[PDB]
């Protein structure tokens, strides 16, 4: 029943009594449920350090993952280039689920095409799909370029890439002159950065291995920057920002922020900015190129390092002080260009808000996952916060990363209880957040499950989670943040205090029994 | 008009090659309300073109994600990389009760997570592995399903064979399901790829068993996800009526509710197209009858309870029409609050394959008009059973396009346009109110009298939203 | 008892068994408290109906205010100008006061001086006082110029203001030329947004009066801005950012902005940046002059439009999507610039996001307070998301101010439910948060209260405050959030859906109860 | 050295006009352990130098801020115009339990709210309107007060007539209390006109009942105003010695407790300052002794309970000694974590009474030394206890303006500055590392064994934190 008045949605409409009883009735009547007191007695059994230990035993089975596959990682790359659309040979499915994936977590249309391989198609190969493809695509979305990135079926059969793109273009269905970029792109091999990884170096390859002589390093006077796989707007904005404000010339290749974000002005824009074909052409005539997220970013430090003879400078994401001040600083020694005094006053403010905040951030333990450079940058700002990072968690990261991270712990006393957990799964950290617990959680909303069922063992038990990471689809905006840079820490350091006071507050609420520490001034 | 509306789809089509549009031109019609067969008018569920923007999900959507993943006691395995899995992990509201990770597994992304060696070497050592370390980990689980990724078809994996010896070992029902991407051409062949997969290996179990108290009475929902409740919100309405309701398809279903089915007296089926094929199976080993019914909306569910009933008794008859004397003021509030606001609004809708007819009758209920409407990935009877819902000369589309859409949508000019994730945010930057038709905007559940009020509500803050006046900027 | 490896704090430390022991010893001791079912039938008594109209029926007394006195508004306000010490004439405690309210939200040093008059000055006058304490203070800080205001028991006694500062200079304790602008301002009359306005006019008038003829107008083809009472650094940050986004001159008159954001390098600057003498000497040539905050600027409208002949412009301060149109196309009217293509895009971006977000922000309720300026922009934004504003509260508002919000509440089919309380304090509110319930309250760190009570009567009944407004003391850097302009409507848009997201989550959040609804994707 | 601080002193004087330097010269000096009386050292409790910056609040402070408004019961209007009451609420963590807004007021601000009608007529019928107001309002309360603002005092209002009569009404205390902040010269007269004026209306009510039933071992907490739960903490070892606490001054303070008070064998006096007025009073009255103790740091508590125990009889001092003996394992673990942490380490402390002598034992207790320490408004004979525990040649303020201070800190250079809000913003900036003497940083209690672990933890935290070798940019 509906009073039309308060009209109620699922939530709490079937909270209503005969809803109520309705479902008890198909629960004991139809169900076979296991009694109460057996899923009690099995809930409490995983909270346990018994059963950890079982669950850290697991060689075949991966529950609740925090990587997702290459081809996103290509199709977000893609997305970078001007008038580019990214194009998935493969099979279909894997499309619609990535423009999904993508359209929840910004919030923007994501486009997307597949040359959508069948069974047969499995048999024969998929050169038709690819001829008719790259004909129907160009002709009906008009996009100046095409990168071709694959699905895991295609990866399977074998599809040969260069020799379907040029086999098009020989048979005469698209230009020989039409930028057709490639990369294949495993899903079995590694995660969506590193999609992102092959996707770029494919492109910056494409665009400048055939033509070298020409090109003379450090003749254009612009630092190249490749920022890996990143999904917040603010990260895009800030590193162009300061470069700008610095006065340094630089080149931002794959740059996907004016598309993920298009204004609702009454017209529809399929593509929006982008990095041009003749930035990625005269690329190699920068003093340098910058990578900002090293980790996922190998395969192309390897060519540009190789092919553009660009000495890429080691360091780390910008994330916090440190690594902003080294990126800031670097930046400065390659562009000639000194760091202003607006910027030194932008890191003040900083340190003031870290010197504000440090009382209630101190000691505080976290558990945190994500990709690898992000993960790495956190872990590396809340030690100079001074915060405890007990359990960090990279799914797709490596042994080398592991040793790095290692390093950094052990450079700080804050590391003292931190341990690095590499291809483990959310499951094993809700095991590691109930046996040892953190104060709160860092990471995307896969985490708001964990959360759910610690506050199912107790209160008292419960870690809040703490939104930063990628994909975020239970809040909105959050996209629009910015991690990296001082403006980044400012934002970090800002939802954390904030997230442990207004936790604080939740706890002391309660009235004439621990309202007496629920303080108007915090 | 007609010869406009035929102009549009001709002048449409003209910036395609000739391959894919002398194809196209097959699956878009002008609809004709006179006739009886779809195949004059329209062809369908035939291979997408490359390269054109196809809405379609693959057939690991369709049985993983459909049919499969709401059973909420079984737990299922995405079987090749990690990808399928993640992206459709609680993506779908198929609601549920139960302690999650403890004897209810649906948000849960299971998977083997195939890495190269896998691939090369092959999957089923792994896959026994995965099984044996399911169970120690989740011990009250009452099920377990592989669904198969593109690669396991691919590699010659068997897990019929693993599917089989585990399941003897453990004495527990183990499903191997071949739901791969490239089998099919949309997310339609994994509903029969599913439905044939819980007939073959979890239907017959009690086949013999003859410990259950039947009445004459007891039905079963069939093709009911429960999105948003909507299954529950459906359950209510029946038992009010009299009738049992046995078990749910699969939203909020359970492996004992599903093997219990056989047992019911008429199988009522909400969703033709994901399970008429078990539907027909159980008519035909069980002998028990199906009929499509429709929830949406006041006018379809009492003409659907009205129908069902008659199915049964008088005591049933006779309690069918006082539960439609109870809700009917109810309803007819919401009309009086709602249709006012949402009179004479024309609507668009582009979703998979059973709510593009279904939900006109509860449009029209508020007065707004279906000016065009089409199907994912819908097989002729479902357009069998749309052309008569919809109205003269109306743009009907089958695998429509992201391109043909938009223009579709430029020259028809809709108020509100109901559809999923992918076509929304064009939209509302194009400044036309849109619903999501999938998910109902996570709101709902949409379903019955209850579900009504919910759907006019929405359709109403949506399509009036102060936001659609504020688009151009006030400087020109 | 404290462990040494885990140290409790005073929460929860009491929440101990042997201090819960002694707390209910004494409370049953010495303390004479009222039984707990007296405590409980009074407290369930106030939530109700019968209650809120014996509270509304007062006419002497005030509970828990929601505005200040005006000397704190004329100390912020002197903290806009250059190298200037706010100087108060008349008790020290107030000046105590000023600072630490300054100091807890700001979190920023706040440099302010006294004359510190005693029992004995109030028989003899403040003369002594005025003549010694500018004496010192110019020879101790330095500052440039030195602006007086006066506490109440100064207004009470009468001292003349213009008359000691003439006699301070004319005796020879500070240089004739020194500036020193003053304005009286009576805490009984007004708030500190009307103290803020007279320190203004003052300023204003000190330095433009004398001369008016060499002025003309429209001669430096500049806009000057006047702020008016603001906490937040963003409002000064974004209004300046869009006047040079649009190319307009400008002049912000009462700029605290530099000083109130410090960085921390080493050295404490008492001051930075602000007004200059010659940008207010000079600000008569201005084409026009804007007031960002109208309600509160009456006293300086008026020696604007008739001692400098500008034609203020008559528009609301520039909050939500109409207003901040309003203001930019105004700007563009003065100035004659165009509003440039970066500006637009920002407006189109606001809108998406208002698009994207519309469905969970519909129809929500809301209680709101605020300074009238503030309120009044919020109530638009609210109605302009489809938001119901139920309960909106100016503790300092007016009348005038009243019917012009009553107007815009009757402009917007979404305003039905709403209604404009005046001189009702957050006591008053309190009473109507739980008669009539609103989803959220948007306001102060005041209201950290009145949630803590509706949590009490139950989990239902209670009202989570969302803190926009001044005074915020019990988050972190919120000051440093902007509420003006496109940025800031997206701002406070972002906070909302979030807190109803938050929301959500939380009611969701129980096992097998109610996380059926405690979805992914939102 | 005696010579370098001396010529510091007259270094940094040389800013300042004649009168203000010639005066204040007086209120700075360079410490002898030696002398027995403050005034040939340093004057002080005299009128500040205007425009200067003195740290100095006005005597509502003192009476409204300190003394009453931690009494939980009662209810305390602040009598003038808005902003006394506003900028003062909830603003010191006077920690206390109860129901508020129904049984206890301390975090509410309650005021007549003057404006011109109320200066130019008087606020006496007001005042009168208001008392039958928070009557109906708020029934529970347990007595009533005004604090007088600073226009009480002038405008010719009589709150005494009004107090007397209503109060004699309403069969309520109502206690008019003059606390304008002209009177005085600093927060100090405001705690004595606060004293005056518990005693002349709330401490002799139960003068002649003799129904409360009294132990030899009662006693009350005098000036300890649990501030972040201080007296809570210092508390529960009295009660754990043996002894009983039947009232504490005024924090967690209930008016019963107050009445209940002169039925206590001894009276325990914390801060001296505020509340030495009245237990002269009490002792000349009713007889009753006090003794001041101290119960920051191990060292001064053992002391403390050690004295405390020796006024009361074998039983009591072998009790004093099993809680020495329970806690001295919890106590010398935090020290021995935290003092190779804080060691060597010097303080300046600026506070306003009874906290810059008082905490000076439990730093030492870390091997902390305090270099330097001064008085918001003490009074001499707070001074003669203060040299005593200061070491020799550090430097002593009275009053300090905020120039002289940050002139001495920059010369002094101190690792650590314990102060209060005005102050901390400055010297974070200066890159010195602050903890807040008055709210304890929000931290606390601070006093007794419990309070000492944090107090340890919290010096370090905030001394060691690793912010403070990030202050000067790398790129120099
Ligand atoms: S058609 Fe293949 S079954 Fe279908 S949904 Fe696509 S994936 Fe899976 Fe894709 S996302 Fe990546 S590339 Fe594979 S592993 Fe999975
Ligand atoms: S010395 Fe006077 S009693 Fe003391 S604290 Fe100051 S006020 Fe009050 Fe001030 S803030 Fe304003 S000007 Fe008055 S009303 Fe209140
Ligand atoms: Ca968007
Ligand atoms: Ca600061």
Same mark, same amino acid.
């Given at each position: 029943?509906?009073?039309?008045?308060?009209?109620?949605?699922?939530?709490?409409?079937?909270?209503?009594?005969?809803?109520?009883?309705?479902?008890?009735?198909?629960?004991?009547?139809?169900?076979?449920?296991?009694?109460?007191?057996?899923?009690?007695?099995?809930?409490?059994?995983?909270?346990?350090?018994?059963?950890?230990?079982?669950?850290?035993?697991?060689?075949?089975?991966?529950?609740?993952?925090?990587?997702?596959?290459?081809?996103?990682?290509?199709?977000? /790359?893609?997305?970078?280039?001007?008038?580019?659309?990214?194009?998935?040979?493969?099979?279909?499915? /894997?499309?619609?689920?990535?423009?999904?994936?993508?359209?929840?977590?910004?919030?923007?249309?994501?486009? /997307?095409?597949?040359?959508?391989?069948?069974?047969?198609?499995?048999?024969?190969?998929?050169?038709?799909?690819?001829?008719?493809?790259?004909?129907?695509?160009?002709?009906?979305?008009?996009?100046?370029?095409?990168?071709?990135?694959?699905?895991?079926?295609?990866?399977?059969?074998?599809?040969?890439?260069?020799?379907?793109?040029?086999?098009?273009?020989?048979?005469?269905?698209?230009?020989?002159?039409?930028?057709?970029?490639?990369?294949?792109?495993?899903?079995?091999?590694?995660?969506?950065?590193?999609?992102?990884?092959?996707?770029?170096?494919?492109?910056?390859?494409?665009?400048?291995?055939?033509?070298?002589?020409?090109?003379?390093?450090?003749?254009?006077?612009?630092?190249?920057?490749?920022?890996?796989?990143?999904?917040?707007?603010?990260?895009?904005?800030?590193?162009?920002?300061?470069?700008?404000?610095?006065?340094?010339?630089?080149?931002?290749?794959?740059?996907?922020?004016?598309?993920?974000?298009?204004?609702?002005?009454?017209?529809?824009?399929?593509?929006?900015?982008?990095?041009?074909?003749?930035?990625?052409?005269?690329?190699?005539?920068?003093?340098?190129?910058?990578?900002?997220?090293?980790?996922?970013?190998?395969?192309?430090?390897?060519?540009?390092?190789?092919?553009?003879?660009?000495?890429?400078?080691?360091?780390?994401?910008?994330?916090?002080?440190?690594?902003?001040?080294?990126?800031?600083?670097?930046?400065?020694?390659?562009?000639?260009?000194?760091?202003?005094?607006?910027?030194?006053?932008?890191?003040?403010? $900083?340190?003031?808000?870290?010197?504000?905040?440090?009382?209630?951030?101190?000691?505080?333990?976290?558990?945190?996952?994500?990709?690898?450079?992000?993960?790495?940058?956190?872990?590396?700002?809340?030690?100079? $916060?001074?915060?405890?990072?007990?359990?960090?968690? /990279?799914?797709?990261?490596?042994?080398?990363?592991?040793?790095?991270?290692?390093?950094?712990?052990?450079?700080?006393?804050?590391?003292?209880?931190?341990?690095?957990?590499?291809?483990?799964?959310?499951?094993?950290?809700?095991?590691?957040?109930?046996?040892?617990?953190?104060?709160?959680?860092?990471?995307?909303?896969?985490?708001?499950?964990?959360?759910?069922?610690?506050?199912?063992?107790?209160?008292?038990?419960?870690?809040?989670?703490?939104?930063?990471?990628?994909?975020?689809?239970?809040?909105?905006?959050?996209?629009?943040?910015?991690?990296?840079?001082?403006?980044?820490?400012?934002?970090?350091?800002?939802?954390?205090?904030?997230?442990?006071?207004?936790?604080?507050?939740?706890?002391?609420?309660?009235?004439?029994?621990?309202?007496?520490?629920?303080?108007?001034?915090? | 008009?007609?010869?406009?509306?035929?102009?549009?789809?001709?002048?449409? !089509?003209?910036?395609?090659?000739?391959?894919?549009?002398?194809?196209?031109?097959?699956?878009?019609?002008?609809?004709?309300?006179?006739?009886?067969?779809?195949?004059?008018? *329209?062809?369908?569920?035939?291979?997408?073109?490359?390269?054109?923007?196809?809405?379609?999900?693959?057939?690991?959507?369709?049985?993983?994600?459909?049919? #499969?993943?709401?059973?909420?006691?079984?737990?299922?395995?995405?079987?090749?990389?990690?990808?399928?899995?993640?992206?459709?992990?609680?993506?779908?509201?198929?609601?549920?009760?139960?302690?999650?990770?403890?004897?209810?597994?649906?948000?849960?992304?299971?998977?083997?997570?195939?890495?190269?060696?896998?691939?090369?070497?092959?999957?089923?050592?792994? !896959?026994?592995?995965? *099984?044996?370390?399911?169970?120690?980990?989740?011990? !009250?689980?009452?099920?377990?399903?592989?669904?198969?990724?593109?690669?396991?078809?691919?590699?010659?994996?068997?897990?019929?064979?693993?599917?089989?010896?585990?399941?003897?070992?453990?004495?527990?029902?183990?499903?191997?399901?071949?739901?791969?991407?490239?089998?099919?051409?949309?997310?339609?062949?994994?509903?029969?790829?599913?439905?044939?997969?819980?007939?073959? #290996?979890?239907?017959?179990?009690?086949?013999?068993?003859?410990?259950?108290?039947?009445?004459?009475?007891?039905?079963?929902?069939?093709?009911?996800?429960?999105?948003?409740?909507?299954?529950?919100?459906?359950?209510? !309405?029946?038992?009010?009526?009299?009738?049992?309701?046995?078990?749910?398809?699969?939203?909020?279903?359970?492996?004992?509710?599903?093997?219990?089915?056989?047992?019911?007296?008429?199988?009522?089926?909400?969703?033709?197209?994901?399970?008429?094929?078990?539907?027909?199976?159980?008519?035909?080993?069980?002998?028990?009858?199906?009929?499509?019914?429709?929830?949406?909306?006041?006018?379809?569910?009492?003409?659907?309870?009205?129908?069902?009933?008659?199915?049964?008794?008088?005591?049933?008859?006779?309690?069918?029409?006082?539960?439609?004397?109870?809700?009917?003021?109810? #309803?007819?509030?919401?009309?009086?609050?709602?249709?006012?606001?949402?009179?004479?609004?024309?609507?668009?809708?582009?979703?998979?394959?059973?709510?593009?007819?279904?939900?006109?009758?509860?449009?029209?209920?508020?007065?707004?008009?279906?000016?065009?409407?089409?199907?994912?990935?819908?097989?002729?009877?479902?357009?069998?059973?749309?052309?008569?819902?919809?109205?003269?000369?109306?743009?009907?589309?089958?695998?429509?396009?992201?391109?043909?859409?938009?223009?579709?949508?430029?020259? *028809?000019?809709?108020?509100?346009?109901?559809?999923?994730?992918?076509?929304?945010?064009?939209?509302?930057?194009?400044?036309?109110?849109?619903?999501?038709?999938?998910? #109902?905007?996570?709101?709902?559940?949409?379903?019955?009298?209850?579900?009504?009020?919910?759907?006019?509500?929405?359709?109403?803050?949506?399509?009036?939203?102060?936001?659609?006046?504020?688009?151009?900027?006030?400087?020109?």
């Amino acid at each position: 029943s509906q009073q039309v008045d308060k009209i109620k949605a699922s939530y709490p409409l079937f909270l209503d009594q005969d809803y109520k009883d309705m479902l008890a009735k198909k629960r004991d009547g139809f169900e076979e449920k296991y009694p109460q007191d057996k899923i009690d007695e099995v809930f409490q059994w995983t909270t346990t350090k018994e059963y950890q230990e079982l669950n850290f035993q697991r060689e075949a089975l991966t529950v609740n993952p925090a990587k997702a596959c290459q081809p996103l990682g290509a199709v977000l /790359c893609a997305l970078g280039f001007e008038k580019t659309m990214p194009y998935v040979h493969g099979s279909q499915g /894997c499309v619609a689920y990535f423009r999904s994936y993508f359209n929840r977590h910004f919030r923007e249309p994501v486009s /997307c095409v597949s040359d959508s391989m069948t069974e047969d198609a499995a048999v024969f190969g998929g050169q038709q799909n690819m001829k008719d493809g790259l004909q129907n695509c160009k002709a009906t979305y008009k996009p100046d370029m095409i990168a071709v990135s694959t699905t895991c079926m295609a990866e399977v059969i074998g599809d040969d890439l260069n020799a379907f793109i040029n086999n098009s273009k020989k048979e005469g269905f698209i230009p020989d002159e039409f930028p057709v970029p490639f990369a294949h792109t495993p899903s079995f091999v590694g995660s969506h950065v590193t999609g992102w990884d092959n996707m770029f170096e494919g492109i910056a390859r494409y665009f400048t291995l055939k033509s070298m002589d020409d090109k003379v390093v450090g003749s254009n006077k612009k630092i190249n920057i490749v920022p890996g796989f990143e999904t917040y707007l603010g990260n895009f904005r800030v590193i162009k920002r300061m470069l700008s404000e610095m006065g340094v010339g630089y080149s931002l290749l794959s740059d996907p922020e004016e598309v993920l974000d298009t204004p609702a002005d009454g017209q529809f824009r399929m593509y929006a900015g982008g990095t041009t074909q003749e930035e990625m052409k005269d690329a190699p005539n920068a003093l340098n190129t910058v990578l900002l997220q090293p980790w996922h970013l190998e395969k192309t430090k390897k060519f540009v390092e190789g092919t553009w003879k660009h000495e890429v400078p080691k360091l780390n994401i910008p994330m916090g002080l440190d690594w902003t001040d080294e990126f800031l600083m670097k930046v400065s020694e390659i562009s000639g260009q000194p760091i202003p005094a607006s910027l030194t006053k932008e890191r003040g403010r $900083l340190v003031d808000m870290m010197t504000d905040s440090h009382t209630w951030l101190h000691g505080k333990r976290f558990a945190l996952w994500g990709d690898p450079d992000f993960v790495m940058g956190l872990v590396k700002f809340l030690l100079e $916060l001074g915060c405890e990072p007990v359990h960090i968690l /990279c799914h797709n990261g490596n042994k080398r990363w592991k040793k790095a991270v290692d390093a950094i712990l052990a450079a700080s006393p804050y590391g003292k209880n931190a341990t690095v957990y590499i291809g483990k799964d959310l499951w094993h950290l809700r095991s590691l957040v109930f046996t040892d617990k953190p104060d709160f959680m860092i990471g995307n909303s896969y985490g708001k499950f964990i959360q759910r069922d610690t506050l199912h063992k107790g209160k008292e038990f419960e870690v809040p989670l703490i939104r930063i990471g990628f994909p975020i689809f239970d809040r909105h905006h959050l996209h629009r943040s910015t991690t990296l840079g001082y403006e980044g820490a400012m934002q970090i350091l800002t939802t954390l205090v904030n997230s442990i006071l207004e936790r604080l507050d939740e706890e002391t609420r309660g009235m004439q029994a621990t309202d007496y520490n629920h303080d108007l001034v915090r | 008009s007609r010869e406009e509306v035929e102009s549009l789809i001709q002048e449409v !089509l003209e910036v395609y090659p000739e391959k894919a549009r002398k194809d196209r031109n097959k699956h878009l019609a002008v609809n004709d309300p006179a006739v009886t067969q779809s195949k004059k008018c *329209i062809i369908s569920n035939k291979k997408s073109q490359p390269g054109l923007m196809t809405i379609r999900g693959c057939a690991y959507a369709g049985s993983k994600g459909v049919v #499969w993943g709401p059973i909420k006691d079984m737990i299922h395995i995405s079987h090749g990389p990690v990808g399928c899995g993640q992206y459709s992990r609680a993506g779908r509201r198929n609601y549920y009760i139960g302690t999650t990770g403890v004897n209810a597994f649906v948000t849960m992304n299971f998977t083997s997570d195939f890495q190269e060696k896998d691939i090369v070497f092959g999957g089923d050592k792994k !896959l026994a592995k995965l *099984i044996d370390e399911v169970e120690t980990l989740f011990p !009250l689980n009452k099920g377990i399903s592989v669904q198969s990724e593109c690669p396991i078809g691919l590699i010659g994996d068997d897990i019929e064979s693993v599917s089989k010896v585990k399941g003897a070992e453990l004495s527990k029902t183990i499903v191997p399901v071949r739901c791969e991407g490239f089998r099919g051409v949309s997310q339609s062949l994994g509903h029969h790829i599913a439905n044939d997969a819980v007939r073959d #290996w979890v239907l017959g179990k009690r086949d013999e068993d003859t410990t259950f108290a039947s009445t004459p009475y007891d039905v079963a929902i069939i093709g009911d996800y429960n999105i948003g409740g909507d299954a529950w919100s459906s359950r209510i !309405l029946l038992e009010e009526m009299g009738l049992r309701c046995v078990a749910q398809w699969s939203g909020d279903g359970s492996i004992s509710e599903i093997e219990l089915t056989p047992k019911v007296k008429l199988n009522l089926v909400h969703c033709y197209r994901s399970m008429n094929y078990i539907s027909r199976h159980m008519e035909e080993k069980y002998g028990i009858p199906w009929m499509e019914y429709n929830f949406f909306g006041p006018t379809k569910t009492i003409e659907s309870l009205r129908a069902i009933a008659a199915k049964f008794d008088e005591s049933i008859q006779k309690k069918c029409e006082e539960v439609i004397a109870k809700y009917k003021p109810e #309803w007819e509030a919401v009309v009086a609050k709602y249709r006012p606001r949402l009179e004479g609004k024309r609507v668009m809708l582009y979703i998979g394959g059973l709510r593009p007819r279904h939900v006109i009758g509860a449009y029209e209920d508020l007065g707004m008009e279906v000016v065009g409407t089409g199907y994912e990935f819908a097989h002729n009877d479902d357009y069998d059973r749309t052309m008569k819902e919809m109205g003269d000369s109306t743009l009907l589309y089958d695998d429509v396009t992201g391109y043909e859409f938009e223009e579709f949508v430029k020259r *028809i000019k809709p108020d509100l346009i109901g559809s999923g994730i992918k076509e929304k945010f064009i939209f509302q930057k194009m400044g036309i109110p849109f619903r999501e038709m999938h998910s #109902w905007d996570y709101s709902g559940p949409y379903h019955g009298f209850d579900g009504f009020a919910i759907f006019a509500r929405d359709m109403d803050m949506t399509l009036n939203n102060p936001c659609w006046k504020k688009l151009q900027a006030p400087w020109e």
